[PDB]
Design an enzyme around this catalytic site. Structure first.
Site, mmCIF file in Angstrom:
data_model
loop_
_atom_site.group_PDB
_atom_site.id
_atom_site.type_symbol
_atom_site.label_atom_id
_atom_site.label_comp_id
_atom_site.label_asym_id
_atom_site.label_seq_id
_atom_site.Cartn_x
_atom_site.Cartn_y
_atom_site.Cartn_z
ATOM 1 N N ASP A 10 0.653 -1.156 -0.005
ATOM 2 C CA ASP A 10 0.037 -0.012 0.105
ATOM 3 C C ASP A 10 0.868 1.491 -0.051
ATOM 4 O O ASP A 10 0.391 2.525 0.362
ATOM 5 C CB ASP A 10 -1.066 0.175 1.151
ATOM 6 C CG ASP A 10 -1.956 -1.161 1.332
ATOM 7 O OD1 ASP A 10 -2.303 -1.437 0.101
ATOM 8 O OD2 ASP A 10 -1.978 -1.645 2.066
ATOM 9 N N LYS A 69 -12.095 -4.578 -3.344
ATOM 10 C CA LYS A 69 -13.489 -4.778 -2.485
ATOM 11 C C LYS A 69 -14.701 -4.273 -3.252
ATOM 12 O O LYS A 69 -15.422 -3.495 -2.657
ATOM 13 C CB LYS A 69 -13.152 -3.978 -1.153
ATOM 14 C CG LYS A 69 -12.074 -4.283 -0.296
ATOM 15 C CD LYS A 69 -12.020 -3.568 0.907
ATOM 16 C CE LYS A 69 -10.774 -4.268 1.981
ATOM 17 N NZ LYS A 69 -9.412 -3.990 1.249
ATOM 18 N N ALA A 107 -18.079 -3.329 -4.606
ATOM 19 C CA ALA A 107 -19.014 -2.929 -3.791
ATOM 20 C C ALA A 107 -20.376 -2.325 -4.460
ATOM 21 O O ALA A 107 -20.854 -1.272 -3.788
ATOM 22 C CB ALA A 107 -18.588 -2.525 -2.279
ATOM 23 N N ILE A 151 -23.382 -2.114 -7.878
ATOM 24 C CA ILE A 151 -24.619 -2.999 -8.218
ATOM 25 C C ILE A 151 -24.015 -3.829 -9.363
ATOM 26 O O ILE A 151 -22.805 -3.870 -9.828
ATOM 27 C CB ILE A 151 -25.490 -1.969 -9.023
ATOM 28 C CG1 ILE A 151 -25.106 -1.422 -10.346
ATOM 29 C CG2 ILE A 151 -26.213 -0.988 -8.151
ATOM 30 C CD1 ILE A 151 -26.090 -0.699 -11.261
ATOM 31 N N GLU A 161 -24.035 -4.588 -12.463
ATOM 32 C CA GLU A 161 -23.776 -4.309 -13.805
ATOM 33 C C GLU A 161 -22.584 -3.563 -13.744
ATOM 34 O O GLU A 161 -21.601 -3.848 -14.568
ATOM 35 C CB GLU A 161 -24.641 -3.321 -14.606
ATOM 36 C CG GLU A 161 -24.476 -3.313 -16.075
ATOM 37 C CD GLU A 161 -24.867 -2.068 -16.532
ATOM 38 O OE1 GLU A 161 -25.523 -1.278 -15.706
ATOM 39 O OE2 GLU A 161 -24.931 -1.930 -17.906
ATOM 40 N N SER A 196 -11.419 -5.993 9.538
ATOM 41 C CA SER A 196 -10.656 -6.155 10.716
ATOM 42 C C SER A 196 -10.567 -4.640 11.698
ATOM 43 O O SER A 196 -10.068 -5.008 12.938
ATOM 44 C CB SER A 196 -9.138 -6.430 10.286
ATOM 45 O OG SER A 196 -8.637 -5.264 9.673
ATOM 46 N N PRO A 209 -6.170 -10.218 7.146
ATOM 47 C CA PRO A 209 -5.342 -9.002 7.309
ATOM 48 C C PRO A 209 -5.591 -8.645 8.661
ATOM 49 O O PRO A 209 -6.314 -9.083 9.510
ATOM 50 C CB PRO A 209 -5.958 -7.944 6.330
ATOM 51 C CG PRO A 209 -7.500 -8.359 6.365
ATOM 52 C CD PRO A 209 -7.496 -9.803 6.445
ATOM 53 N N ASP A 225 -1.899 -11.320 15.583
ATOM 54 C CA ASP A 225 -0.671 -12.433 15.845
ATOM 55 C C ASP A 225 -0.479 -13.349 14.750
ATOM 56 O O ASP A 225 -1.393 -14.079 14.376
ATOM 57 C CB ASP A 225 -0.566 -12.891 17.315
ATOM 58 C CG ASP A 225 0.510 -13.882 17.310
ATOM 59 O OD1 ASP A 225 1.462 -13.380 17.682
ATOM 60 O OD2 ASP A 225 0.560 -15.052 16.983
HETATM 61 O O1 LIG Z 1 -27.107 2.468 -5.342
HETATM 62 C C1 LIG Z 1 -26.631 2.734 -6.127
HETATM 63 C C2 LIG Z 1 -25.403 3.353 -6.156
HETATM 64 C C3 LIG Z 1 -24.658 3.528 -7.483
HETATM 65 O O2 LIG Z 1 -23.716 4.564 -7.129
HETATM 66 N N1 LIG Z 1 -25.074 3.342 -8.566
HETATM 67 C C4 LIG Z 1 -24.271 3.896 -9.655
HETATM 68 O O3 LIG Z 1 -25.084 4.855 -10.450
HETATM 69 C C5 LIG Z 1 -25.164 4.589 -12.086
HETATM 70 C C6 LIG Z 1 -26.275 3.990 -12.603
HETATM 71 O O4 LIG Z 1 -26.078 3.840 -13.684
HETATM 72 P P1 LIG Z 1 -27.365 3.544 -14.711
HETATM 73 O O5 LIG Z 1 -28.401 4.589 -15.107
HETATM 74 O O6 LIG Z 1 -26.929 2.943 -16.084
HETATM 75 O O7 LIG Z 1 -28.341 2.501 -14.067
HETATM 76 C C7 LIG Z 1 -23.938 3.450 -11.942
HETATM 77 O O8 LIG Z 1 -22.724 4.099 -12.428
HETATM 78 C C8 LIG Z 1 -23.868 2.476 -10.414
HETATM 79 O O9 LIG Z 1 -22.411 2.151 -10.432
HETATM 80 C C9 LIG Z 1 -26.183 2.613 -8.675
HETATM 81 O O10 LIG Z 1 -26.710 2.439 -9.831
HETATM 82 N N2 LIG Z 1 -26.850 2.113 -7.519
HETATM 83 O O1 LIG Z 2 -10.739 -6.335 6.909
HETATM 84 C C1 LIG Z 2 -9.843 -5.967 6.323
HETATM 85 C C2 LIG Z 2 -9.600 -6.104 4.889
HETATM 86 C C3 LIG Z 2 -8.686 -5.675 4.193
HETATM 87 O O2 LIG Z 2 -8.553 -6.221 2.818
HETATM 88 N N1 LIG Z 2 -7.714 -4.965 4.781
HETATM 89 C C4 LIG Z 2 -6.694 -4.784 3.944
HETATM 90 O O3 LIG Z 2 -5.421 -5.300 4.488
HETATM 91 C C5 LIG Z 2 -4.225 -4.576 4.741
HETATM 92 C C6 LIG Z 2 -3.603 -4.423 5.962
HETATM 93 O O4 LIG Z 2 -2.431 -3.598 5.950
HETATM 94 P P1 LIG Z 2 -1.663 -3.591 7.516
HETATM 95 O O5 LIG Z 2 -1.107 -4.906 7.596
HETATM 96 O O6 LIG Z 2 -0.825 -2.473 6.969
HETATM 97 O O7 LIG Z 2 -2.687 -3.314 8.504
HETATM 98 C C7 LIG Z 2 -4.649 -3.252 4.010
HETATM 99 O O8 LIG Z 2 -4.393 -3.255 2.555
HETATM 100 C C8 LIG Z 2 -5.999 -3.115 4.442
HETATM 101 O O9 LIG Z 2 -6.654 -2.369 3.193
HETATM 102 C C9 LIG Z 2 -7.694 -5.008 6.253
HETATM 103 O O10 LIG Z 2 -6.698 -4.161 6.735
HETATM 104 N N2 LIG Z 2 -8.977 -5.255 6.775
#
Ligand SMILES: O=c1cc(O)n([C@@H]2O[C@H](COP(=O)(O)O)[C@@H](O)[C@H]2O)c(=O)[nH]1
Ligand SMILES: O=c1cc(O)n([C@@H]2O[C@H](COP(=O)(O)O)[C@@H](O)[C@H]2O)c(=O)[nH]1
EC number: 4.1.1.23
Lengths: 218, 219
Positions: free
Chosen positions: B13, B65, B67, B69, B71, B120, B173, B181
């Site tokens: 990172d 990650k 997260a 919709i 599509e 975590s 992680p 640990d």
């Molecule tokens: O709850 C949500 C949150 C979003 O950011 N979006 C985003 O808004 C846009 C919806 O586009 P569309 O009008 O083609 O369905 C997409 O970029 C999508 O990632 C969504 O559709 N629902």
């Molecule tokens: O639950 C989670 C999921 C993760 O991907 N991570 C990711 O794992 C790594 C943890 O790094 P660190 O050992 O510096 O704490 C970071 O890249 C973080 O985004 C996390 O720490 N907790």
């Protein structure tokens, strides 16, 4: 935030040429573009500056930040360095993760949009039951900008009730996902529209049509 | 499952290409699996995945990650796999359709999905923890084989291992900087993820070697 025509373009085309062409075709109708990972991961973070150079539009980086606080800070810093005016942040990972984003946004003169409930069917499984509490968390944290779902106007109305009339609320799911532009604007300040515009035979006519349908709301 | 050398995955990172390359190169003898996230990708471009492959011959987990919709999830996964990532991380809390979208692309493209269950950090207790067992069970129902769970909560990591079964692959992680640990975590996880404990060390190679020495009997 003053969004022209209460309409935010979701530019999820993944080719730079097409994304610039289509945005250019609808530029007279918008001044706010949402750029997400589809375009950024295909063309690079430099695309944000390119949009500002070409259109002068405001840019919301729709990155739905959803990591631990330490990582969230880095993501926000990189995003604002690229010239984004605002960033979207998931509330589900909790208050410390949201605060990390708020801190960087304050430092760099930008805004955080808190995503509460999502628009797709899967949002019903876990997000919907947490959404009111996520919104209250936003209020507690001083969040002023929110995202909620066009596809569930009763939920969108509830979100508006929680955050109050002073907060700013934008809403995706209009068009392709089934949400109605005018009904959504009963509660949201602005609608987000992607495919209904950018996949249309004629994107300019698509945008113009949407705006015509909400003309009494502008 | 992927064969992770020394049961140790580097969380790279650092946000500067030169530093990221230097440190990864220094620990390459100890680690053949690197997790690259948005801090580095948003700073240096998706071509950083290419550069790591060219320089190190390490597997790459794109820790994005996912997260969104369904599509949009599909588009993110496609772009990520196109760039050369071996695997991508995906949030489960947006629900089964969003996860399935990622699985479908991974299947089509010959790559892997890691499902993030519980996180975590302290904030994970607010909403994610209460959903995590069900997110895990959902993953099992969807045919997910690879999972992420928290080193910082051994009791939760243990329960998540139970839910997914011994045949599933689990990485964890929160080791080192966040307080977890290495040895305790490897009771349940197949591999530990370590970032700052290695990449902020005066001698990252010595830091990695020290971690590995501490778990030598578990290799
Ligand atoms: O709850 C949500 C949150 C979003 O950011 N979006 C985003 O808004 C846009 C919806 O586009 P569309 O009008 O083609 O369905 C997409 O970029 C999508 O990632 C969504 O559709 N629902
Ligand atoms: O639950 C989670 C999921 C993760 O991907 N991570 C990711 O794992 C790594 C943890 O790094 P660190 O050992 O510096 O704490 C970071 O890249 C973080 O985004 C996390 O720490 N907790």
């Amino acid at each position: 935030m003053d969004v022209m025509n209460r309409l935010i373009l979701a530019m999820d085309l993944m080719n730079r040429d097409d994304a610039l062409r289509v945005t250019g075709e609808v530029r007279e109708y918008i001044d706010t573009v949402k750029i997400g990972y589809p375009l950024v991961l295909s063309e690079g973070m430099d695309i944000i500056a390119e949009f500002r150079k070409r259109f002068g539009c405001r840019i919301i980086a729709d990155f739905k930040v959803a990591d631990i606080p330490e990582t969230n800070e880095k993501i926000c810093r990189a995003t604002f360095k690229a010239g984004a005016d605002a960033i979207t942040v998931h509330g589900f990972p909790g208050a410390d993760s949201v605060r990390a984003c708020l801190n960087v946004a304050e430092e760099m003169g930008r805004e955080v949009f808190l995503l509460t409930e999502m628009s797709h069917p899967g949002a019903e499984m876990f997000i919907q039951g947490a959404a009111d509490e996520i919104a209250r968390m936003g209020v507690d944290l001083g969040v002023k900008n929110y995202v909620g779902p066009s596809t569930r106007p009763e939920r969108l109305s509830r979100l508006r009730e929680i955050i109050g009339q002073d907060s700013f609320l934008i809403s995706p799911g209009v068009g392709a996902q089934g949400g109605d532009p005018g009904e959504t604007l009963r509660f949201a300040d602005a609608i987000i529209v992607g495919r209904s515009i950018y996949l249309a035979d004629n994107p300019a006519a698509a945008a113009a049509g949407i705006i015509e349908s909400i003309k009494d709301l502008l």
